[PDB]
Structure formats: C-alpha cells, structure tokens
Ligand binder design. Structure first.
Ligand SMILES: O[C@@H]1[C@@H](O)[C@H](O)OC[C@H]1O
Length: 271
C-alpha cells in the first residue's frame, strides 16, 4: 500500500477534518493509506518537521499545507529530487517544484470578499479585520486582495486588523477587544474558518447585531446557522472536501504514471 502524508495547518480544525475526509475517500477508492498529520497549534517549524520526517520515512507522496512563503521551497525540492511527489494544498509555495497546487486563488478570494463587503454595507464606513495568523501566507493574501479591492472600489476604511491565530476562543477574545477599542465599526472581515464563528459570538454577546455586519470564510455548520439567523451576512466558501479528494488523486496519478485553481463561492441568506 502506497502511503501518503497529508500535513495540515491545524490538525483539529474542522476545515482540515473536511479536507481529511475528502482525502480518505480518494485513498479508499485508489487503494492508498493517508497519514493525516499536523500540529495542534499553528506552527511553521512543526509543519516543516513533519515534512522532514515524511521525507526520511520515504513515503509514497506528500501533500502539504504551506504556512509561510519561501520557507518550504528547499524541502519540497529536496523531496522531489529524492523522487517523492509533493502537492501543496490550501496554500501554495509557488516558487518550488511541487507537481500541483490544490486550493483557492487567495488574493482573488480576498477581492471577492471585498466586492461582497461593498454590496453589504456600501462604499462608506469602517471595517475591522480578524485574520487567522498575522504572518500566515494565505491570510496575508486574502487581506491583500480585500484591501486592494476596497481601496479602488469604495471609501471603506480599515481601522483595525488583528489576529486569532486561527483559534475559536482567541477569535472571540480579539473580536471583543476590537469592538471595545473602536467607536464606529460597521463591519468585520474574518479570513479563516473559525474566525467568523468567534466574531459572531462576540458581536452577539456585546449586542452589536446589527450595528456590525460580518463577512467571513468557509461553510462550517455554525457559520451557516449564523447566516440563517442574521448574525453573519456572508461567507466565502472553499471546496475543502474536494481539495483533499483531488490532492490524493493527483499524487496517486503520479505514482501510477498517468498525467487550474479552485473557485470560491459567496453564500448569503439567499443561499
Ligand atoms: O488555512 C485554512 C484556511 O484556508 C481556512 O479558511 O481557515 C482554516 C485554515 O486552516
């Protein structure tokens, strides 16, 4: 049995458990084993260590999350040179020899969120940002696209940006801190899966629904309920299950000698 290591951002995050589910479905169909790994707290060094161990173990393939630009290139290329195929997932290391990237165009997803934000609150007002790690590659990319969009297409001001490190409780805490130190926030932009849930708890608890609208990421059950009940105005949905499934199929196609980025969708109370 071919063994494929899948290295996640955070092993217990429901987004990554969805990715794992897709990966396991593919592995079942293709007859491979998926070893699903990752740190309990976001850590580039831990990810790289898992990558090193996978490489030393001579596994059949490696699918890896990329937490920081330029930090993965060497190990990816060294693994490719040892004949181990690498796929990146849900954040890319574009300047490497990985055979494929499975995930979103993250700057573009940010632009998409910017357009929805303008649709939801108009062209004037104050926005605060909650990101899942300040120095995390696809978070920075999402903030970059969002910022570019609203800069060119509105008069919206970003008055505060802070980090949850992609944890739910920290998202709640930081969002309360943001609402407390700012006097006229009209909306929150949340860029990782648990951020929107945490932010929603904070706005609900502080009685800011609805003075504060929320645009966030991903379609976790709590987020979809918050869209139903009016707490969240919109969420930007990625195809996480499909990313897992596709990554494993690409690795297996490579091992068996057999031979475009994933669009995002907006979900509203309509949807
Ligand atoms: O990197 C992941 C991101 O794509 C998702 O939106 O939020 C959870 C993170 O682990």
């Amino acid at each position: 049995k071919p063994k494929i290591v899948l290295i996640s951002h955070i092993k217990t995050n429901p987004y990554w458990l969805d990715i794992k589910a897709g990966a396991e479905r593919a592995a079942k169909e293709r007859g491979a084993v998926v070893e699903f790994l990752g740190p309990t707290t976001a850590s580039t060094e831990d990810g790289l260590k898992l990558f090193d161990m996978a490489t030393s173990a001579k596994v059949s393939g490696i699918i890896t999350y990329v937490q920081e630009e330029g930090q993965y290139k060497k190990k990816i290329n060294s693994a490719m040179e040892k004949g181990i195929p690498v796929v990146t997932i849900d954040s890319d290391e574009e300047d490497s020899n990985r055979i494929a990237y499975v995930g979103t165009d993250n700057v573009l997803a940010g632009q998409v969120a910017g357009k929805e934000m303008v649709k939801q609150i108009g062209t004037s007002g104050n926005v605060a940002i909650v990101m899942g790690g300040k120095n995390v590659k696809n978070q920075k990319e999402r903030v970059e696209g969002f910022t570019q969009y609203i800069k060119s297409n509105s008069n919206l001001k970003i008055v505060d940006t802070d980090s949850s490190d992609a944890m739910l409780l920290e998202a709640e805490i930081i969002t309360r801190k943001i609402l407390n130190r700012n006097d006229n926030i009209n909306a929150l932009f949340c860029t990782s899966a648990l951020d929107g849930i945490g932010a929603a708890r904070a706005v609900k608890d502080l009685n800011y629904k609805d003075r504060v609208k929320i645009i966030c990421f991903d379609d976790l059950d709590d987020t979809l309920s918050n869209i139903r009940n009016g707490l969240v105005s919109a969420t930007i949905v990625q195809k996480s299950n499909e990313m897992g499934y596709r990554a494993v199929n690409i690795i297996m196609d490579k091992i068996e000698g057999k031979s475009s980025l994933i669009d995002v969708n907006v979900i509203n109370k309509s949807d």
